Write a protein that binds this DNA or RNA. Structure first.
Ligand SMILES: [Ca+2]
Ligand SMILES: [Ca+2]
Length: 293
DNA sequence: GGGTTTCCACTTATTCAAACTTTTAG
DNA sequence: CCTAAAAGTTTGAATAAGTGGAAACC
C-alpha cells in the first residue's frame, strides 16, 4: 500500500494504462446460459507493482496478481467495489476515447445492479453494450444473439482538465530521452515525447497549445498509425516541461528517469555538456535510465 | 445446495515508449 | 565553423485487452 495517489493523477494514469472489461461467458450452469463479469484493470511491468499497490490503497478495492513472468495486474471486479470506480470517474472524468468505454461500463453496471443480467432481456442488453466496448463481440458471441447490433459510439472530444491529469497520463505515455548525437563527437539533445493512437489526435494536437511547445509527427508501422508529441528545444524543456512535472510529480519508475533527465538538464544549463568531464557524467547518467535502469 | 460471484493463472497483439541516425537552422 | 533544433528511422515489448479454470460465496 503506502503512498496514496492524487485522484486527477490517477485518472490521467487510467486514461493511459487503464482498461474496462465486460465478460459474457458461455455457462451451462447459468439459468440464462451465460455468466458475466464487470470491472476495470491495469497491467504493468513488474517494476511498477508499487503503482498498483498505491492505486489499491487509494481506492481500497481490487486484487493484485501476476500477469505472466514480467507483468502484474490490478483488477476490480467485485460488484460492490465497482461503485468506487464509478464514484471516482464521475468526480475525475476521463478525457480520451476510453471515456466511451467507461460510459458503457456504467450501462452494464446498471443492468447488473437491477439483477437483469440473470434474465434473457438483461443478457441481450449486455451483448449490445459489449458490442461497442473495446474490441467488441467475438464472432461466436455475435452469432449467438441474432439481431442488428450497432458497433458505433459517440467520439470523445475533451480537453486536458489540468496539469495533474497530464502528470498521470505522462506517467503512462511519457518518455524522457538523453539523445547522444554522434568536434567532441557528441551533441547532447534532451527529448521529451508522448505517444498515442491517432484516435485521439485532437487531444495530442492540444499538447502543443497546452504546453506552449513541441511538434506532432505521424508514425506508421504497417497498417498501424499513431502520433508522437516531441519537444527538443532546450529552453522549452527547461522552462515549460521540467517545471510542469516538478510541480506535478510523476509516479512509477519513470519518475527516476525524469529526475536523471533533470540532472542532465542542469548540466546543459551550465554548459558542462561541452566539457570532456561533463559529457562523461551525462553518458553515465544515460546508461542507468530507461531500459538501462 | 445450485446458481452466481470472485479470484487466479495465463495468453495475445499493438499501441506504445524507446533508441538511434541524418539533415537543417541560426 | 559551431552548436542547437528539427527531421528521420526502426522495433521490441509493456502495455491494453482478453480467455480458461475453478474456488468461493449467497
Ligand atoms: Ca494507452
Ligand atoms: Ca507506460
Amino acid at each position: 500500500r503506502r503512498e496514496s495517489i492524487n485522484p486527477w493523477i490517477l485518472t490521467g494514469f487510467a486514461d493511459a494504462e487503464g482498461s474496462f472489461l465486460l465478460r459474457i461467458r458461455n455457462n451451462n450452469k447459468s439459468s440464462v446460459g451465460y455468466s458475466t463479469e464487470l470491472g476495470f484493470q491495469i497491467t504493468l511491468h513488474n517494476k511498477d507493482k508499487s503503482i498498483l499497490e498505491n492505486i489499491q490503497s487509494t481506492w481500497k478495492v481490487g486484487v493484485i496478481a501476476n500477469s505472466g513472468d514480467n507483468a502484474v495486474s490490478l483488477k476490480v471486479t467485485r460488484f460492490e467495489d465497482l461503485k468506487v470506480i464509478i464514484d471516482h470517474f464521475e468526480k475525475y472524468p476521463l478525457i480520451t476515447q476510453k471515456l466511451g468505454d467507461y460510459k458503457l461500463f456504467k450501462q452494464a453496471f446498471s443492468v447488473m445492479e437491477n439483477k437483469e443480467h440473470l434474465k434473457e432481456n438483461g443478457i441481450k442488453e449486455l451483448v449490445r453494450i459489449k458490442a461497442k466496448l473495446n474490441w467488441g463481440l467475438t464472432d461466436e458471441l455475435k452469432k449467438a444473439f441474432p439481431e442488428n447490433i450497432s458497433k458505433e459510439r459517440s467520439l470523445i472530444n475533451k480537453n486536458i482538465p489540468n496539469f495533474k491529469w497530464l502528470a498521470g497520463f505522462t506517467s503512462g505515455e511519457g518518455h524522457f530521452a538523453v539523445n547522444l548525437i554522434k568536434k567532441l563527437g557528441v551533441q547532447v539533445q534532451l527529448r521529451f515525447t508522448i505517444t498515442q493512437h491517432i484516435k485521439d489526435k485532437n487531444l495530442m494536437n492540444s499538447l502543443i497549445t497546452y504546453l506552449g511547445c513541441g511538434y506532432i509527427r505521424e508514425f506508421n508501422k504497417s497498417e498501424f498509425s499513431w502520433l508522437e508529441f516531441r519537444v527538443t528545444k532546450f529552453s522549452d524543456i527547461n522552462d515549460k516541461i521540467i517545471p510542469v512535472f516538478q510541480e506535478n510529480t510523476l509516479i512509477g519508475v519513470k519518475l527516476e528517469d525524469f529526475e536523471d533527465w533533470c540532472k542532465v538538464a542542469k548540466l546543459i544549463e551550465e554548459k558542462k555538456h561541452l566539457t570532456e568531464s561533463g559529457l562523461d557524467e551525462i553518458k553515465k547518467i544515460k546508461l542507468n535510465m530507461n531500459k538501462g535502469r
